[PDB]
Design a protein around this ligand. Structure first.
Ligand SMILES: Nc1ncnc2c1ncn2[C@@H]1O[C@H](COP(=O)(O)OP(=O)(O)NP(=O)(O)O)[C@@H](O)[C@H]1O
Ligand SMILES: Nc1ncnc2c1ncn2[C@@H]1O[C@H](COP(=O)(O)OP(=O)(O)NP(=O)(O)O)[C@@H](O)[C@H]1O
Ligand SMILES: O=C(C[C@H]1NCCC[C@@H]1O)Cn1cnc2ccccc2c1=O
Ligand SMILES: O=C(C[C@H]1NCCC[C@@H]1O)Cn1cnc2ccccc2c1=O
Ligand SMILES: [Mg+2]
Ligand SMILES: [Mg+2]
Lengths: 482, 481
């Protein structure tokens, strides 16, 4: 049911795929979207994964209110949604809807932390967040209301905080790679792109090859002690000296879902990795109009039970007045990784035909071997989905030496890996220059740093920065961005 | 550390209990509170239970926006919070924050449902809700922002919808009685208290004896078809005929947590039922003037291992910067069901000292018999908490037959089970009268709490306790939250 081609009209393909797969429904308020069960199940799955992992690290869940009074929020402004009335009565002070929870949580932290006995404090909350985005909205990727988790920790030393920052970053890599089969690059944000309220910002970056755009998948901040000075979060150490806590913060949103969609979708529609898919195997009985004698649906129900015994999430599409081909296309558009076809011949030979969504390959499998084989296949699918994706990621990055190679590489919708001197003036200059050169070619075009990757390619002695010509410190990943 | 006592100043005791147990933090905006880990973990337990149970029923989770246009919300009004500005710029049209999701979900239902092949449609969502309550706020019980689940379903027939209504209400009874050990009464609301947009409203009701006030614990509505008329949610049946859907909606909130605290809390603080306790057994090593520190700690570790192999959620408070008595009262005010103490003497005896939070009784238990005796004790604590609460509930209800006994019973902080004619005018009459007499005595009006499913025998010719016409059914009235 997907008519737009993915590599040609990418935007139309995306909107079509997310609507026709029954994942999102559009809404009369711009930038907001209904998340239907088909996408919300994926959200629940990654949420359970991340929650278990952070509970293993001693992180505890909380809920702080979504309203913050004006005087507490102010001590970014154009994006804040303000409540001024309840009914027709005006409030004595306008209250903001949560754009993030620093100004709600850190006063509580100031109260709760007095002693070194109170450290480390590790809190997380799953919640919704409202920001009146000026950029044009994209479902999942950039929405005016989005779901996320935000974690905030305070420690007695910077080293423990940095350790937690890196552990959370690894959990985000697993979120994207183990759950969603999306490859991401760990990296350090530049000083012009890092969270201004912190010391050092780490990130995972993903790549959309259709439009050649980089996107920040999740963020992890070594905040340091300036939030503690601002909010007076102090503690007495063992000697009795007052000291500031070292803080970290980290967050990840439903944007991940969108990334996943863009990574694995094809011309037929979605491809949902088996680890997060709401239905892993849909059983489609080959039946036409008004002649269901009970044989085929009976065997389909027995097979559903046998598969569910193996923890496989299974649905039987037994709806009438739909041809089997229609159902095939329906569940292919939805992205079900495995399709089980059971017809009269399969009933006669004790077999079933299983089709992979990602490659289309078919398999004849006897009933007795259904649960093992399918399990095998699912992992295969998952792994294949990652591998191909990573290949595409790596084929979208160009190593360059000079600024002359920037604009061609950008026009091939590629990221650029370049030796960079890392001084802050150079990034502003490079953004302005690439934007001007983008407009003069034109028949949001600015290139900024996406990350300074932890995984550094070799840096030969005497390599100069691709822009200023100063000695080059590290390889930096640049590109157009969301 | 709790010093106010539950049968003297109930409000002071309540806030002391929720603050000192590290469950609630007060917030500058009145009516809103910070849920700290200790309370949010209990919320997570009951959420997991209910989510699993409704997923067995084929209900699926979703998420609809929290914003509704003024257009669609106004097709109660003083409770709606309005967004009017982003930054400094005013919105062209103001936007409401979700007080409930009917006006957000039901247009999508009209769009999604076309045929009988789409029914039943069963959606649920866990979200927060904002209502600018005029009543005096109470942490958990009545807040301006609160967490809930709201489920909405659409069926082809009224039979199926009503069966789902009853299933959901049974799930709420299990939520309160099986997890929170809080006894509740199933019933239906009078026509003056039911959800005005629906046909029949079922409910479960709890009772706070210290102020004698009933409280609606959860609700489950048979909406009928009027919402289908209003939003045009119609489907073709197998004969090609266009029919309206029969809808249900149900919801329940963090209020349950409060009803737990007021139910099992005593003068030493909280008592958490073991089924919802993040920590069921806390292990406290006794270390003093350096005696057997390492051996005590090692056997604490292996005791934790042994107990977790039986699925017992165990925490070892080996924190060095706190004294054993401090840990004692910390975990006692927090409400942990069992405390296991291990000193040098018990290290020699091969035993451990176990104190149960609810009754305070202590046991000397072998290291070998620890797991089974602790599981026995945990289910004993859970069942006895429930049974004591059930006895208190039954003692707070007085069967009466004439209005002359209402306000006496109301003054002993009791509910009234009275025979009633079920006439709408009668209930407002009764509430205004009870209001006037409560004022004359100087604590609030009296309303119908519910009409219980388990009806006592109604002898023929029994008269309504207020009007005098033939009494239809036994109705539970009282003062309410
Ligand atoms: N409107 C949005 N919708 C969905 N996800 C978002 C949105 N804004 C930010 N995110 C994600 O949330 C993560 C943490 O939030 P945050 O650090 O506040 O983003 P940010 O600083 O506003 N970056 P950006 O808005 O893209 O310039 C980001 O790394 C994004 O992946
Ligand atoms: N402010 C609140 N805080 C906590 N729980 C609430 C609040 N309002 C309602 N609830 C609970 O949510 C359930 C479903 O909400 P709802 O039916 O809209 O309550 P309601 O009609 O407003 N009744 P009430 O406001 O108490 O007169 C109720 O049965 C209550 O148990
Ligand atoms: O949200 C953050 C910082 C961290 N907050 C905790 C979770 C991870 C996150 O990166 C950045 N940010 C983004 N957008 C805004 C809009 C309005 C007001 C404040 C902000 C604002 O502060
Ligand atoms: O929310 C309900 C009814 C049901 N909604 C679905 C979930 C279960 C719940 O009982 C009732 N109500 C209560 N309070 C309001 C305040 C403002 C606007 C609308 C309302 C409003 O409608
Ligand atoms: Mg932003
Ligand atoms: Mg209300």
């Amino acid at each position: 049911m997907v008519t737009a081609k993915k590599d040609e009209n990418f935007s139309e393909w995306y909107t079509q795929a997310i609507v026709r797969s029954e994942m999102i429904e559009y809404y009369d308020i711009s930038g907001c979207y209904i998340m239907r069960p088909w996408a919300f199940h994926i959200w629940e799955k990654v949420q359970r994964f991340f929650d278990d992992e952070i509970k293993k690290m001693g992180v505890e869940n909380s809920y702080f209110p979504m309203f913050v009074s004006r005087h507490k929020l102010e001590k970014f402004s154009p994006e804040v949604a303000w409540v001024t009335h309840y009914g027709d009565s005006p409030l004595p002070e306008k209250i903001a809807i949560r754009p993030t929870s620093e100004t709600i949580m850190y006063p509580a932290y100031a109260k709760w932390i007095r002693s070194h006995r109170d450290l480390p404090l590790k809190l997380n909350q799953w919640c919704s967040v409202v920001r009146w985005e000026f950029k044009q909205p994209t479902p999942f990727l950039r929405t005016r209301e989005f779901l996320w988790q935000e974690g905030h920790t305070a420690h007695a030393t910077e080293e423990e905080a940095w350790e937690l920052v890196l552990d959370i970053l690894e959990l985000y890599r697993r979120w994207y790679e183990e759950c969603l089969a999306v490859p991401v690059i760990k990296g350090e944000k530049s000083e012009g792109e890092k969270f201004a309220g912190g010391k050092k910002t780490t990130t995972v970056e993903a790549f959309i090859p259709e439009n050649g755009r980089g996107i920040q998948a999740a963020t992890s901040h070594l905040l340091g002690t300036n939030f503690a000075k601002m909010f007076e979060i102090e503690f007495e150490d063992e000697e009795g000296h007052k000291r500031l806590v070292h803080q970290t913060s980290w967050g990840c949103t439903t944007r991940s879902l969108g990334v996943m969609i863009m990574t694995h979708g094809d011309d037929k529609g979605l491809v949902i990795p088996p680890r997060v898919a709401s239905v892993q195997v849909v059983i489609i009985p080959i039946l036409f109009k008004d002649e269901n004698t009970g044989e085929i649906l009976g065997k389909c129900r027995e097979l559903k039970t046998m598969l569910e015994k193996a923890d496989i999430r299974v649905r039987i599409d037994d709806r009438s007045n739909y041809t089997p081909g229609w159902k095939y296309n329906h569940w292919e558009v939805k992205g079900v990784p495995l399709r089980l076809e059971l017809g009269p011949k399969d009933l006669a030979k004790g077999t079933a035909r299983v089709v992979r969504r990602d490659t289309g390959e078919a398999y004849q499998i006897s009933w007795a071997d259904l649960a093992p084989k399918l399990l095998e296949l699912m992992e295969g699918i998952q792994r294949s989905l990652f591998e191909k994706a990573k290949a595409r990621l790596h084929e979208g990055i160009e190593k360059i030496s000079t600024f002359d190679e920037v604009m061609p590489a950008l026009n091939r919708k590629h990221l650029v890996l370049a030796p960079w001197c890392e001084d802050p003036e150079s990034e502003e200059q490079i953004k302005k220059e690439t934007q001007k050169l983008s407009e003069i070619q034109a028949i949001t075009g600015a290139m900024k740093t996406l990350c300074i990757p932890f995984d550094q390619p070799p840096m030969p002695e005497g390599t100069k920065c691709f822009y200023t010509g100063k000695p080059a410190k590290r390889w930096t990943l640049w590109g157009r961005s969301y």
